[PDB]
Amino acid sequence: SPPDYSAAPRGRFGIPFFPVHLKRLLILLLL
Structure with a gap:
């Protein structure tokens, strides 16, 4: 692909x- 942006934002x-x-x-x- 081209590169992506999956570096999840925060703040x-x-x-x-x-x-x-x-x-x-x-x-x-479950426990």
């Missing part, structure tokens, strides 16, 4: 490590 409309805490809820539910 302005972006994806920090947020799904950790939530997937940890699901893992605990």
Whole structure:
């Protein structure tokens, strides 16, 4: 391809490590 931009933004409309805490809820539910 041409190069891409998948370097996830943060501190302005972006994806920090947020799904950790939530997937940890699901893992605990399973546990």
